[PDB]
Symmetry: D3
Subunit: 147 residues, 6 copies
């Protein structure tokens, strides 16, 4: 008998990012919004940075400023709030020192300590209900070593 399963993977051998539990991060995520609290439940996940060189510092920024755009109207865009490892993420690059990442402290050689990843969004005129419908965008992730 035959059951079929697609296997895909995403290699990169200088530096990558996976969840603490070793599985790959997903390729997409659905955020929720609450009528009662008028806000969006965020998305938390734990990640360990892998690398071939732990000695390097690590700088972070979004390839471009993240938004959830109405899929039937471009003019409607509620901004996306990104946060990694206690630090807010934007175009304005943030630097992450190796010793501040706790490399020894975890894992087999190279792997870092778990860092929190949060993604969320808020209405631009926060507190006034957003317009109904579906929304979408891409949070893109830029991180290099050596500043």
């Amino acid at each position: 008998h035959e059951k079929n399963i697609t296997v895909t993977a995403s290699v990169d051998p200088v530096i990558d990012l996976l969840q603490a539990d070793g599985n790959a991060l997903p390729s997409a995520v659905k955020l929720a919004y609450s009528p009662a609290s008028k806000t969006f439940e965020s998305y938390r996940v734990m990640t360990q940075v892998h690398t071939n060189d732990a000695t390097k510092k690590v700088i972070v920024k979004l390839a471009d400023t993240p938004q959830l755009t109405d899929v039937l109207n471009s003019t409607v865009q509620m901004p996306i709030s990104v946060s990694w490892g206690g630090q807010v993420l934007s175009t304005t690059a943030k630097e992450f020192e190796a010793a501040a990442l706790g490399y020894s402290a975890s894992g087999v050689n190279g792997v870092s300590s778990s860092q929190e990843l949060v993604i969320s969004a808020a209405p631009k005129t926060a507190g006034t209900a957003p317009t109904a419908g579906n929304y979408s965008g891409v949070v893109s992730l830029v991180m290099t070593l050596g500043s």
Copy 2:
């Protein structure tokens, strides 16, 4: 380095439905069927109804009667069994009183107590093996406040 993640969300600010854990319900679900027990493992999930007005009663029905239709033969349809919060769901509307939902009892203002959601299906001539192959359909969800 660049890793890409799609962010989508689904706003609605009068009333919505999310899982108890605050994440959004999925957009699709795979049910299983068992050869040995000749039945289908159901799908359970916990949800909290959000709203801008807790005072309203809540009526529920499927936009239309739910089925799993063979994807290579429309003539083959095993019916879909839906159940929310101890009450079976159909076209025949079911009413859910606010005080019976336990609003105060949970959460920040407005949010309700967790309610179970079950989806399943059975062979129409239950007990005689269904024909092999893939099947599909949409469970659509109708809930309004004020009867």
Copy 3:
């Protein structure tokens, strides 16, 4: 109000495979690869074989030898390592005896004891970094009863 959810399922009433928790196996899986350890985190999952006849032995092999093929270059293929229930899986068929599967030992009639399922992959010249980019393939699953 209307929220939409797709329900799909995959019937087969002589023999099927589902996870121990009763949910269906996914249709696809993303493996991860680690820069630091230069390896791929595997994918473990627990399954119970269902059947209409527990008395039969069970033979296993992949419909064809499993690979992760660069999606922009066919010439790049890192091999896929498959393992089920303590036994490595390949084209070379492996036989699984019913009494060795522990049928009584579990579940309502017919269902077997949980068996581990591992999928992974390794560089073909293991220890030398693989080339970056995305990769893909299908692990296909062949299991019949009666050898």
Copy 4:
């Protein structure tokens, strides 16, 4: 050359009615509630349960055996009251009724097993306008239920 692993196996058997977890696991004997200095509140403990009965036609009455309190474990005069909740109805010494039909016995699983229902135990300071004194506390939630006839 003797390698042995011991595991203690216990069970609270009741043949008429019992409240288990949604997953079929037994409820905890004990639960620990954290408290937040930042938000000045306790994090409620929540768990999905299902009544299992031998008579699914019967009503279900549930009540606490005594008003539950967090008690300073070095000073019995210090208390914060415990709040309990089940299937959306706040519990008390004053009983609450749950009709067999509002329990969802049809909609779920085997005979005599209910739909799932949220059990919540939290606590609070006496006047939210003030914080509790530091230290350890403890208390007992004593759940009491008859089905009827």
Copy 5:
């Protein structure tokens, strides 16, 4: 002005063979089994395990040290027998053998660690045609294993 949190750290170290959980966590010292009045049965406890050994070439013998029973904790005459299972083989006082090759040592993880195997502890009434008396019970599963030479 002193805020301290204490955590007790324990460990059962065996250098030759030990059975851990699939996730690497240590097995429980204790397990609680719920019982269902509706279905008149106990919910088995199940957990994925992996033998870790220092010799993966050796056979693995496993057995209970004494036939396990649930015992009424107010009346020792009252018992329901405990059923134990591992890697699909029912356990007993009578040993069972598990060949190094049927354990899946190659297929998984580091040297000396097995594929995953289901450990099941449940129990039952003495004659399914009757229910147990209400009350609390308890018992001990005492797992015994040699590898060999």
Copy 6:
């Protein structure tokens, strides 16, 4: 005809600072570390935590109250040292400082609650070139933290 389920409710209340789990659950009083004969090492216990404070402008100092050890519970002379870690900084008797800004107080949740941080307790043999003697051990991790002014 009396069916009652008792649940013990406890709580460690501190109004100035407390470390809870990321999910809001209270940390464990106790943790069990398995050890692997195959890999000759212990499986570290790991859990995501968040400081909750009443002053998110303050620094956070954290230290152990005494150097933690696994102690043979039949022979006090036998020890394996315990290693503790939090938010990527190895803990000790020698204090460690954590600036309010390196904690991620903005990036997460309600006022006064930090971003998540990994707490790790593991242990090791004294000279990795040798194994520990078999038996049970136990010890105490005693976490100590001031915020400051």
